[PDB]
Amino acid sequence: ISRLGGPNFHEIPINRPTCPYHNFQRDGMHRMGIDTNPANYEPNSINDNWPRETPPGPKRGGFESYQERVEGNKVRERSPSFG
Amino acid sequence: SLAPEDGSHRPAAEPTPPGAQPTAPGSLKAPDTRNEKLNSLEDVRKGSENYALTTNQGVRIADDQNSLRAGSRGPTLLEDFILREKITHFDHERIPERIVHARGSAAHGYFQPYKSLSDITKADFLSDPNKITPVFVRFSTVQGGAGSADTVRDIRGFATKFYTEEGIFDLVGNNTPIFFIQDAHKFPDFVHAVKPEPHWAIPQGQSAHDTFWDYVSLQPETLHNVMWAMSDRGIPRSYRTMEGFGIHTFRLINAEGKATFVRFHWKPLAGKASLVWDEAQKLTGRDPDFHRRELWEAIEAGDFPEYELGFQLIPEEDEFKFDFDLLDPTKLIPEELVPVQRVGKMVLNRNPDNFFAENEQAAFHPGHIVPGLDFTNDPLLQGRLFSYTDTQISRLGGPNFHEIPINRPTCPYHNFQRDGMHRMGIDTNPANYEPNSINDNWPRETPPGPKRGGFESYQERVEGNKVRERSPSFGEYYSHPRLFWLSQTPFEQRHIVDGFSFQLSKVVRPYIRERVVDQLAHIDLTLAQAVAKNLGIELTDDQLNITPPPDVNGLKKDPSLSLYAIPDGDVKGRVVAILLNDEVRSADLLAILKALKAKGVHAKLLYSRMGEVTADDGTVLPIAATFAGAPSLTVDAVIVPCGNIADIADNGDANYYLMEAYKHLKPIALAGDARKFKATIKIADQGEEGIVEADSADGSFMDELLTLMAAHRVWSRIPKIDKIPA
Amino acid sequence: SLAPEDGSHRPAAEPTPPGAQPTAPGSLKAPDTRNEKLNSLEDVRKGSENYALTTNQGVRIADDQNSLRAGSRGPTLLEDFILREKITHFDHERIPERIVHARGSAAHGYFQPYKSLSDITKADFLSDPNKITPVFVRFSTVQGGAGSADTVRDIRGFATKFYTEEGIFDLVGNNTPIFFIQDAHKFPDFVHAVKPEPHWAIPQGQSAHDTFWDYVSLQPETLHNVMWAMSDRGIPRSYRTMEGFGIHTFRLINAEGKATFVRFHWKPLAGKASLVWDEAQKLTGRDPDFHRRELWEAIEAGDFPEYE
Amino acid sequence: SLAPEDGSHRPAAEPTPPGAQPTAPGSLKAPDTRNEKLNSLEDVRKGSENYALTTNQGVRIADDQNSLRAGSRGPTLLEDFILREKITHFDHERIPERIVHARGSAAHGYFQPYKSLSDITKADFLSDPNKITPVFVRFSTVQGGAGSADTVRDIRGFATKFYTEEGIFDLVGNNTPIFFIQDAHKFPDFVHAVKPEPHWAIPQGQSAHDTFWDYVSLQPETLHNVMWAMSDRGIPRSYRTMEGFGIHTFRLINAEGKATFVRFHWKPLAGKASLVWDEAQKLTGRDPDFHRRELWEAIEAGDFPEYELGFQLIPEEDEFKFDFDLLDPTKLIPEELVPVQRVGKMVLNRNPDNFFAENEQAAFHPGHIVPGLDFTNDPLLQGRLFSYTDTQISRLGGPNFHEIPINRPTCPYHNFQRDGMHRMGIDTNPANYEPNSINDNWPRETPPGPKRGGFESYQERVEGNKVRERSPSFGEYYSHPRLFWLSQTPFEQRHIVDGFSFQLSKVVRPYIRERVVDQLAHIDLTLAQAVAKNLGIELTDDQLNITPPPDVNGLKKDPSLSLYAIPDGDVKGRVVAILLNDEVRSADLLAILKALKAKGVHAKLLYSRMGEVTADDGTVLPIAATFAGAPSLTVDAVIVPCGNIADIADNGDANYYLMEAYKHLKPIALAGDARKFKATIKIADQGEEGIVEADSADGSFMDELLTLMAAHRVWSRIPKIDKIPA
Ligand code: HDD
Ligand code: HEM
Ligand code: HEM
């Protein structure tokens, strides 16, 4: 945000994805992309809810975190195994 | 010298009623009002009288009227550094407005507890009734820009910065006890839906548009807060006359380490009061700064905004005792179930000096807590903790925003953080890391403890898998909207119905209106049918048969949810229009002003022109404003004294004054020949409840008027106003 | 599918009168309208239909309704990069508004001269009646913020960007033929005087306050433009029904090097029309976006703003 | 407590020589060294000892070693506001470096004039010899980034901010009396040509690359400052031993309104001295912070950098009496024609506390002048006036950069400018415009006058058409380069030829080399022939016949252009390496050390390891550094005392220490059996000038060594060094 001047740093040519990117984020300094979507929010009916979430799957699916088990209390403490 | 000889350019440094003097920077108007934070700002306050005009580098300017040019009709030269510095500074005056709550009005004050809370929290600011904590408070709307109007229908923000001896605590709340959404991941979606639509940037300061109601219809978790926004809660009369809430369940932590769940409340000591919709909308055109102005002038008059801080406290063992989740910020805790304990009082007693430096630059953030408080896993709160540090890096220019004077703590602050843009502090520590030997590890960590200890999080147990999933316990959307509905008076229900009908009539896509009516039918059939009738929609048989949602823990209403069900009227600080004529009966005017003064009610003397008029005994009466310049929208009640009533009886502006005031349910009082105005508002000869009338202003006349003003508005008049063309 | 079965969510892509259809982005509403600048913007226009929702790095999102937490009632985790990108972008949406003329409304169009002006100017965009130059025009008020109301009493801006074959020419004018002050050195003084006063930031969108009339009373050079502002010129009915002026004397320079002094005008082909004060003031309350709306809806109906 | 119990972590707060103690923030090293700017910074200086570690919001931290996680091996929680604040501030520490002069070292000090200059200027800081003006001075290179090396070949900046009672005056100069170019419109062309090339960003801190010499070969106006850069002026021994110049002609204006043209000079009271190239280039590797380190340590030792301000003064009527234009910044004013008049003395006597806050954020700008000074039409100065205000808007984050503490004036500043990012001052003035009546027009304009008056520009006549055209009076490129060349000693000429030869050797396109050699042939044929021989280029018959440019107003040399032609050596503050052995003759070392201390010369005791050695008589010698750790590059002279010379005589590092010092022309003294080292450097039995040798370090050995040090280097050794493999 400070180094590259704002939240549109992915639009700086070197950083741009070569695959498609579409979402409901808008504006910010030096915004390049001109969005034509009538909707800037989801869920929406006014654009039939596009762009849409994608379920996870074997290829081309949405991102889902691995459901690791978390068990412990809220601590600021170094694991004894690290000592 | 350009000031007038008589010194009438400078306002008196004493409290004065609204309109009596020009308004002024707070340290000029009230120089002897002090608190630890206002005194700490003295290092950066700059005066002006008797100083020379200079560049920012301290060079005295001889001619501030002209650019430097080659010849007096020639081109401007690049060596004019005086012109370029002055135009460069102007060119860079603006900073980004806040992404939400951009329109807001702020004041300084102080808070003091009523008793030590050490049994329930170790927070130092709550440890002793003689502990006085300076505060700075910013009230705001949500959707509109910094230049949008004040009296829009909207939720209002209510943000308090407490400058404590153990750190800054910011309580960043709104004027309703829930929010629209459950999880912070949806906040950009919701905010984009309510904000002006992206193709054309319309509408400003309004939720009455397709995308807002599209999102509401598709996200029934919104309906509870939508109900509050559609009620008269969405159009408060003053920031002095609305409630505040922290919304989220937080924790208090005591010196033994015990955690108690808490929700925060601010109760207005001037009582709860709202406008009516027609009046609020019209006021956005006649005075889009009405709330900003009213707050500033209340403080200059000594009508200080006062609020009691209150805590709803729930033991840790009672986390699951209710039929809603305590961590769900779309659910309220009914006061019938968990009472509000009154904990202390905040008084706002001084305006800023400079709005940009102190209000626009102020940074509030709910993750600014102190030892003795802690967070919960409310998933809207959890995401807020990220946003308010992040947004200030662009808004305020970098990571040193705590060095901007209004944001500075008044207690000590020392650490190993260095640099960043516009770094003010010049660190002398040889070390900028720890652990260090070279400064004997100073500044040093401090263990947690009962007082002056380091912050340690409550050691809550966390058990579960890493999931993006809404708790099933949050999946109930209708029972709170219905409890709120059932708790409103009949006229407050009519205003709700009217709010939904007005908003949905502005939605162009009719299916969205229909989908909202279907949601309302899941709350209350009467509501749904009344809104549907105004939209020309007929409920289906299925909609007529939807089972109402369950009561909340056995409640079918809670009157603390209504603005008006329980009387809390306070007249002090309110304002009356007195409509003058060119020969007022001075004895009416004496009696009126005396009775108002006794109750701390202000007046404004109005006429068809500016200047002065002369009463029957020769008293010279100065005119504050014209009938059109200061419409009835801006006052709480209207009084017409006797005199040469012919002077004004045919004035369309004075007649309209009283029609507008009548339509908006305001008390109206008419003395002697002023009773000829009964005809403009269609009052029967025998009179009507809410119109005070008598041969003279009489004194019993004034008690009756001030009784009506303590009840705020004349609700029983509502069926009579549909006739009035106004 | 959340859209209705009957297609009524989607505005007809053809000219329609105000209120007949929901309004839409211009390239959706009027896909057949083009000019050289609109064509050159194609490389940056982003669509939406039939695309997956992604991060800005192009990773497909599976659940855009929830943060990542340890258990469905537990704390949000710092590793949720989807949540933090989406909220970081939101957090930094705003940029500073314009110091003056922060409220304004804009549209694309095109300009063409009636004949070659080569005897008086070598400016390329005026050289040939067949040469069409794209424009982008913004109209504005002066004093209020970007979220202030349209039908205030104020001067109006009228700024045209001409995308010529020999460079951008911006004609940055107002709707009256003079300004308030003589020397640019005084602009921060005049603008501070008209702007909301610095202790309390009131009033918005209004010159009806002590500091403006203090300045005027001490600087009689301001009285000409003040007359204009106090007339119904200060409250136009539409951006379509107001005059435009460059105000300053500029120069045209022909190919032989001869200079002619020029002042620029725009004539509204819809004619000149203003509100009356009580209407204009009440309209700031009933529809603070009235001029922005009227401009957009005129263009959607085919009532194109035309100026000479 | 992690500090050693003996307190050896903390440097003594008293002057100490380089290396004796760790270096510290200036206010801790020299707390009693004060001036009005240093005292004015006290409101922002932050201590650390005895204070608790906190957030920037003043909350005490208990555990600054760990993030908050769900279990001690679990994930980090978003609610960790202490982690996020600390990492957010870290993440935004950097600000843009300066576009040019990014690499620089600064210090605080004071200036006093020798007598009132009221007859020639009304500037207040020159009006009274007892008026002391605080200064802050930054010295710099030009091309490299803020992390580039100090002893590169380049021009140096010499910038002085004077905090006067009538405004900040910045005198923003370099260490050569002209610049490379004539009109500011070419400054981005020239700087882009000298800077690292745009495809790969190489080379850093070097002009030895194709684009710089392409531009030079095409722009012969650059050749004069190119001559100075290729001489040993381009590689100063220290910031204390270089000249400063304002370059441009400015004006002085006295109280009667008479203008006198002026060029500004600084004379170094430590004398002029430069490195030799091979030493400078090696030093950029062994100690890229050598000038920063040397400045800081001189100040800590009390070897304060001192400079005398002087003026070349030309009456208005003599504007056109020279062969060159006074407004042309590629031309110098020879001191034989217009002598420098001594004006006053500047002493730098305190280091900053924090480099970022004071050095990195300092803003100097040559448009910051005061009444009694004014500009001329020099077309390089004229463009500079635009640039320095503009560049601070991005570098320092907006238009409030004069509020960052180091940049604040010490005199009053008041005006109508408001807001902007990072606004610190809270204005209380009811008015933010003038003229105003509501504050009686304060702060007010001030007419010009003899003292404490408003700024007014000198009413110079302008007459001409609007043109983009270079004055024909500027179109002469070669006579000043030639005057410079002929003014240098024979060894300085050799060093110039080697500078051009080395640089053009790195230009990869040979045609660029050839074109530069052709330009040299227009300056002086001996120069062009010598550089051509080193490049393997043969001059054509046409080149051999170019007629030399004219003399400059009759001069064929001016010795004041040489670093060394006129002796001005000063040994105080210089440093000598003493090569120890394991049993040093202690009487030698007593004599050596006390002779050095008597003349303020520092010593560094070196050996093959750290720790101690014990002398013949039991004296314990603490070791400063090893041979390889503190190479001969970092010292002015080398002394080897007698003792057990066999300890070190076959040590490769010890031998090479002497070879390197010998190649770089440094004085070397050898006592007793240390004379066995004569074979390493090939010195004859009957010895040679520049090598001091005796049976012992007594009698005249130290006087002879110190004589050699006052002459800086042994130039007569140059023909002896080419054979030597070092
Ligand atoms: C037209 C542009 C321009 C030109 C022609 C010059 N400069 Fe410059 N100079 C800059 C534009 C600039 C700058 C972009 O404004 C800098 C970089 C960062 C800053 O604050 O100023 C700067 C920095 C800078 C600094 C470092 C100040 C400091 O320590 O922060 C020095 C000493 C000079 N310059 C000296 C000179 C001299 C003696 C010049 C010719 C006589 C000269 N500059 C020409
Ligand atoms: C849950 C109900 C919420 C309430 C009552 C609330 C209240 C507020 C208030 C009162 C302010 C104004 C502070 C001021 O006067 O200066 C504010 C500003 C802000 N809020 Fe919150 N908010 C809520 C939810 C959120 C969420 C979930 C996010 C982020 C996902 C958020 C992000 C912001 C941002 C970015 C600002 C501007 C802050 C600044 O620029 O300093 N709000 N909100
Ligand atoms: C001569 C009378 C003037 C007229 C008619 C005029 C007209 C305008 C207009 C129409 C805009 C808005 C452009 C848009 O729609 O984006 C504007 C912006 C601006 N004007 Fe001028 N102006 C005048 C005088 C000045 C003067 C004298 C200055 C300063 C010396 C000035 C400084 C600015 C600034 C700082 C902005 C905002 C520009 C931006 O942020 O892009 N105005 N003015």
Q: Is the minimum distance from the CB of B384 to ligand 2 under 6 angstroms?
A: yes
Identify whether residues B563 and B592 lie together within a single domain.
no
Range of the domain at C304: 24-308
Q: How far apart are CA D316 and CA D310, in angstroms?
A: 19
Last residue of a domain, one of D572, D594, D614: D572
Run of H or E including B387: helix B379-395
**Which residues in chain B are closer than 8 Å to A68, comparing Cβ atoms?**
465-466
Identify whether residues B532 and B582 lie together within a single domain.
no
Contact D579, D627 (CB under 8 A): yes
CATH number at residue D511: 1.20.1370.20
Contacts 24+ apart (CB under 8 A), D278-282: D278/D663, D278/D664, D279/D633, D279/D664, D280/D151, D280/D152, D280/D153, D280/D235, D281/D151, D282/D631, D282/D633
Pocket (CB within 6 angstroms of ligand 1) = D 98-101, 104, 138, 140, 157, 159, 172-174, 179, 184, 187, 247-248, 329, 362-364, 380, 383-384, 387-388, 391-392
Structure tokens at D501: 């030869």
Q: How far apart are CA B670 and CA B708, in angstroms?
A: 14
Tell me the pairing of strands C157-164 and C167-174.
Answer: antiparallel
Q: Which residue minimizes the CA distance to atom 2 of ligand 3? A: C179
Contact D432, D416 (CB under 8 A): yes
**Contact at CB, A1 and B394, closer than 8 angstroms:** yes
Query: Which residue type, as a one-letter code, is found at position D704?
Result: E
The residue to which tokens 């308004």 are assigned: B23
**Nearest CB to D454; choose among B61, B409, B442:** B61
Identify whether residues B508 and B404 lie together within a single domain.
no
Query: Which residue type, as a one-letter code, is found at position A74?
Result: K
Three-class DSSP category at B543:
helix
Residue B259 is assigned to a structural domain of this protein: yes
- Residue C127 has a CB neighbour count (10 Å cut-off) of 17
**Nearest CB to A43; choose among B188, B210, B218:** B218
Instruction: Please enumerate in sequence order all residues whose Cβ is within 8 A of that of D151, keeping only pairs 6 or more positions apart, or say none.
Output: D235, D275, D280, D281, D283, D284, D288, D290, D291
Query: Which residue type, as a one-letter code, is found at position B663?
Result: K
Q: How far apart are CA B295 and CA D282, in angstroms?
A: 70
The CA R_g of chain A, rounded to the nearest whole Å, is 19
Residue B447 is assigned to a structural domain of this protein: no
Identify whether residues D54 and D72 lie together within a single domain.
yes
Three-class DSSP category at B213:
helix
Atom of ligand 2 nearest to the CA of B155: 5
Residue B414 is assigned to a structural domain of this protein: no
Residue B434 is assigned to a structural domain of this protein: no
Q: Is the minimum distance from the CB of C179 to ligand 3 under 6 angstroms?
A: yes
Give, in order, the Cα–Cα distances in Å from B208 to each of A39, B226, B497, B508: 16, 12, 14, 10
**Contact at CB, B422 and D354, closer than 8 angstroms:** no
Structure tokens at D391: 């560049």
Strands (E), D541-632: 575-579, 602-607, 612-614, 620-622, 625-626
The chains found to touch A (3+ Cβ pairs under 8 angstroms) are: B, C, D
**Nearest CB to B402; choose among D45, D57, D371:** D57
- Residue D665 has a CB neighbour count (10 Å cut-off) of 20
**Contact at CB, C70 and B465, closer than 8 angstroms:** yes
Contact D364, D388 (CB under 8 A): yes
Q: Is the minimum distance from the CB of B93 to ligand 3 under 6 angstroms?
A: no
Helices and strands per DSSP (H, E), number in chain A: 0, 2
> To 10 degrees, the CA torsion angle through B56, B59, B62, B67?
-50
Q: Is the minimum distance from the CB of C140 to ligand 3 under 6 angstroms?
A: yes
CATH number at residue D263: 2.40.180.10
Q: How far apart are CA C70 and CA B462, in angstroms?
A: 7
Q: How far apart are CA D443 and CA D415, in angstroms?
A: 6
Identify whether residues D559 and D578 lie together within a single domain.
no
The residue to which tokens 């580039």 are assigned: D148
Q: Is the peptide bond before D113 cis (omega within 30 degrees of 0)?
A: no
Among the bound ligands, the one closest to the CA of C86: 2
Structure tokens at D45: 């200086």
**Among residues D101, D209, D368, D712, which one is catalytic?**
D101
Structure tokens at D321: 């009496």
Last residue of a domain, one of D553, D572, D591: D572
**Contact at CB, D414 and B46, closer than 8 angstroms:** yes
Structure tokens at D257: 């309104």
Query: Which residue type, as a one-letter code, is found at position C221?
Result: E
Residue B373 is assigned to a structural domain of this protein: yes
Q: How far apart are CA D90 and CA D362, in angstroms?
A: 21
Three-class DSSP category at C1:
coil
Identify whether residues D596 and D551 lie together within a single domain.
no
Q: How far apart are CA B462 and CA D167, in angstroms?
A: 62
Last residue of a domain, one of D534, D551, D572: D572
**Contact at CB, C201 and B355, closer than 8 angstroms:** yes
Instruction: Please enumerate in sequence order all residues whose Cβ is within 8 A of that of D143, keeping only pairs 6 or more positions apart, or say none.
Output: D100, D152, D154, D191, D194, D195, D204, D205, D206, D207
Contact B644, B581 (CB under 8 A): yes
Instruction: Please enumerate in sequence order all residues whose Cβ is within 8 A of that of D301, keeping only pairs 6 or more positions apart, or say none.
Output: D15, D16, D17, D18, D573, D602
Identify whether residues D626 and D600 lie together within a single domain.
yes
Three-class DSSP category at B577:
strand
Q: Per-residue b/e over B362-376, b at no fewer than 16 CB within 10 Å?
A: bbbbbbbbbbbbbbb
How many angstroms separate the CA of residue D62 from the nearest CA in chain A?
9
Identify whether residues B366 and B509 lie together within a single domain.
no
Residue B63 is assigned to a structural domain of this protein: yes
Tell me the pairing of strands D637-640 and D575-579.
Answer: parallel
Identify whether residues B583 and B526 lie together within a single domain.
no
Residue C19 is assigned to a structural domain of this protein: no
The total number of structural domains that make up chain D: 3
For D309, phi then psi, to 5°, come to: -70, 130
- Residue B282 has a CB neighbour count (10 Å cut-off) of 21
Contact C148, C163 (CB under 8 A): no
Determine the distance separating the centroid of ligand 2 and the alpha carbon of B100, expressed in angstroms.
7
- Residue C59 has a CB neighbour count (10 Å cut-off) of 17
Q: How far apart are CA B393 and CA D92, in angstroms?
A: 8
Contact A27, C93 (CB under 8 A): yes
Contact C127, C115 (CB under 8 A): no
Determine the distance separating the centroid of ligand 1 and the alpha carbon of D391, expressed in angstroms.
10
**Which residues in chain B are closer than 8 Å to C27, comparing Cβ atoms?**
none
Determine the distance separating the centroid of ligand 3 and the alpha carbon of C54, expressed in angstroms.
40
**Which residues in chain C are closer than 8 Å to A45, comparing Cβ atoms?**
2-4, 9
- Residue B314 has a CB neighbour count (10 Å cut-off) of 18
Identify whether residues D263 and D153 lie together within a single domain.
yes
**Contact at CB, D433 and C78, closer than 8 angstroms:** no
Identify whether residues D511 and D624 lie together within a single domain.
no
Q: Is the minimum distance from the CB of C91 to ligand 2 under 6 angstroms?
A: yes
Burial class (CB in 10 A: 0-12, 13-18, 19+), C106: middle
> To 10 degrees, the CA torsion angle through D112, D114, D118, D124?
0
Query: Which residue type, as a one-letter code, is found at position D220?
Result: P
Q: How far apart are CA C19 and CA D339, in angstroms?
A: 84
DSSP state, D619? -
Tell me the pairing of strands D104-113 and D133-140.
Answer: antiparallel
Q: Is D602 among the residues known to form the active site?
A: no
Residue D459 is assigned to a structural domain of this protein: no
Please identify every residue of C annotated as catalytic: 101, 174
Q: Is the peptide bond before A51 cis (omega within 30 degrees of 0)?
A: yes
Identify whether residues D543 and D605 lie together within a single domain.
no
Structure tokens at D249: 């002609």
CATH number at residue D633: 3.40.50.880
